Amino acid sequence: SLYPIAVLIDELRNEDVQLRLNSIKKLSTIALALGVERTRSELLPFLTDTIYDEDEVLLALAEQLGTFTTLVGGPEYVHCLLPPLESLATVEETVVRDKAVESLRAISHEHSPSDLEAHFVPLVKRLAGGDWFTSRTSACGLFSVCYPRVSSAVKAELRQYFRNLCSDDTPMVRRAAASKLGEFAKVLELDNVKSEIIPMFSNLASDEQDSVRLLAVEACVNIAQLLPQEDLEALVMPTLRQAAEDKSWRVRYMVADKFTELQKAVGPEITKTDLVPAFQNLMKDCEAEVRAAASHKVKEFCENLSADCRENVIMSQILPCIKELVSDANQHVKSALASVIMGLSPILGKDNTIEHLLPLFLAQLKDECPEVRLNIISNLDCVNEVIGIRQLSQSLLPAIVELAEDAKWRVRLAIIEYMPLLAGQLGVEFFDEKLNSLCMAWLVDHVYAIREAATSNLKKLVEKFGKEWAHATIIPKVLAMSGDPNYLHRMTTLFCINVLSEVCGQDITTKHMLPTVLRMAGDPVANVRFNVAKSLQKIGPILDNSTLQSEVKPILEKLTQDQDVDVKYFAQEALTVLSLA
């Protein structure tokens, strides 16, 4: 090896002419050492064939070469970069073949029209008409960048090779051609899109291999946009209508997946004619993957129907299918629907929502699958900003209050975990008047786990409304429990003070909670007493130092003299942790 190039090499390992990783990235510098002439005459050549399999390296080498135009002599020599890139394109680990292509696409623009024809396109062919397969999987991504700029004669040539790539004998070289047919389509003259693209499209849509067919749906969106509305019915729709009917649910899945994109690409008229029925068929597909994909698109679809026929196709074509899906067996499907169904309100109005959706809204808020009622609960903002907070509270509140008080705790625990959500959505004014009551009631529930749930639920609530809202709406009622005759409730009080010090700030804790805590150091029951020690150890860090020494230290010290073993022990522990011992 020789300097300066030898600096790239890693003489310390045991490879096969491997390069220094942290160095291939510092390549623009060696290029600057020797000049532009020597970068071409010796650096590139060395990089071209010295292609070990050190992947982290191969990747960088591919990326780095896409920003070397200028260190090679500028445009006039940009093609010196082809050889090493052509190679890197046919490698293994796709990540590399990708970078190779991205770079090849980048520098394609640097090549002059004349150089494209002389060096680039020729590289496209050798990759297309290449033996190996990856060499072709990657040729597909290089047609759209050179087509527009080369000659009418070469344009033709390029079209032919792209064709041959679509009809390749290998499924992969076909899946690849298909997923790049759209972009290639966009750079051809309308004429050739009709005479050349359409036939390739038609062919790939009716491929023996469905892994190839499901990919032509995406191509259909692109081709469909490029063509004038009147040409759609003759050149495309038969193929698309067939796809939604395809034997392979995978192909149907892609149709429901790209439905909204097809809608736009095809136009309102055809959407009302051909797509509304297709959509209904997909929502009733035997395979739940397809029904779900479809249900997911419900809101986006109705949104895009022509303003004039909108509300009608909805109440007459779409809505009856939706009532069906809310009852589907698969939770996969009820799932997809619930995460978007209430988004239809601002497209049916206050009146329509109140009469036709609010019922489906309840049918799901009381569904078995937890994810389902949760999806409905996570999206109230729109139904709420459409119908009135009262008209909603009038159709949701009884659902909640009925579950917040129910047979099984667990079922109750579930409603406790909707609160931070309902809060954040419906607002603090609604919460202070219809929900705060329920959250306080749970603090005193018979079941411990419920009390516990509601305790930490307060912290989540303060994170939603703030420390001021806490000092005014919640701390007053929480403290009131310290006077409770039942020790289970008095402890609940200290448990709420423990959690609320985490988010109420030093002021509000010292002034409005610390006093109540220190005041219970003389509670008649030992359990409250030692839990007081614990509470001071918990909130101690939030209090400033003067407080910890003037008011806490004394109380703990006294507790250490208590008759009870545990109050004594926990008192000591608190001192030691706070460093007041």
């Binding site: 705790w409 018979h446 079941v447 039942n486 359990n527």
Partner: protein, 288 residues
């Protein structure tokens, strides 16, 4: 040593048995503590009274989910920690471990199953073998069970015990007068306290268990009046509703093993005696 007990408890809460080594330790100390206690152990409220558990470890965890974690919530278990259930070892060891760490927060009584012969017929003995390869852990626990207090008096008004009343015991003093440091006898006061069952036939009757007796309401009223008791709180009997009142409320049964033997389909309950001896029940189903 305290940091240790805390760890042992953290372990047992993950349902992971302690080692033969540690059990031997835990038991020696538990004995020390349990010896000082009386045959009619004084328990001051507030405290939650629990009935049978029988190795149903996950239902025990459900019990703590409902009544609160120890030592925050005080507990009084009326015996029957082993047999029938699938985790006798984890269950009884967690409980004894709670007792050694928090003498004043937990009270454990002896049930008819905290004994040597019955544990070799219904689980515990064989489970110990499958989990320790030898009978030592079983001997450490059955020896310990000899020290378990036969009964507890809460606030000098609520008398708690596993089984029930004996025709050869009419006063709390008669009970304090027994020597409980021995295996459970096949007949007599000590036996009866752990084996008898309240009945809806008057006076004394022949127990279908083959040990102890049945006793009607008349017997309870007399026992209660003669001892300044407001209630007799016991377990030992499967009760579908989890808990059950009988004898014009002079007696209450509290079973804490939901779906007993994993086939009965009964609810379980625990009884909360507050700061004022006011009682409330919590019924629960088996934990999922």
């Amino acid at each position: 040593f305290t940091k240790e007990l805390d760890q042992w408890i953290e372990q047992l809460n993950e349902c992971k048995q302690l080692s033969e080594s540690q059990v031997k330790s835990l038991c020696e100390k538990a004995k020390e503590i349990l010896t000082k206690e009386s045959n009619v152990q004084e328990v001051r409220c507030p405290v939650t009274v629990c009935g049978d558990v029988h190795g149903q470890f996950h239902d025990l965890m459900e019990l703590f989910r409902i009544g609160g974690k120890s030592p925050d919530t005080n507990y009084l278990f009326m015996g029957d920690y082993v047999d029938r259930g699938y985790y006798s070892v984890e269950t009884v060891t967690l409980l004894v471990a709670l007792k050694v760490r928090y003498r004043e927060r937990i009270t454990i009584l002896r049930g008819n199953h905290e004994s040597r012969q019955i544990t070799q017929v219904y689980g515990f003995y064989d489970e110990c073998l499958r989990k320790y390869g030898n009978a030592n852990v079983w001997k450490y626990f059955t020896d310990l069970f000899d020290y378990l207090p036969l009964t507890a008096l809460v606030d000098g008004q609520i008398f708690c015990l596993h089984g029930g009343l004996s025709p050869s015991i009419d006063t709390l003093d008669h009970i304090r007068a027994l020597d409980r440091l021995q295996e459970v006898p096949h007949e007599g006061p000590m036996c009866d306290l752990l084996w008898s069952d309240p009945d809806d036939r008057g006076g004394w009757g022949i127990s279908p268990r083959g040990a102890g007796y049945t006793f009607g309401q008349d017997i309870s009223e007399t026992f209660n009046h003669a001892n300044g008791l407001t209630l007799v709180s016991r377990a030992h009997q499967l009760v579908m509703e989890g808990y059950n009142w009988c004898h014009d409320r002079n007696v209450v049964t509290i079973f804490s093993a939901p779906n007993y033997c994993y086939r009965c389909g009964n609810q379980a309950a625990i009884m909360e005696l507050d700061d004022t001896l006011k009682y409330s029940f919590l019924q629960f189903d088996p934990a999922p």
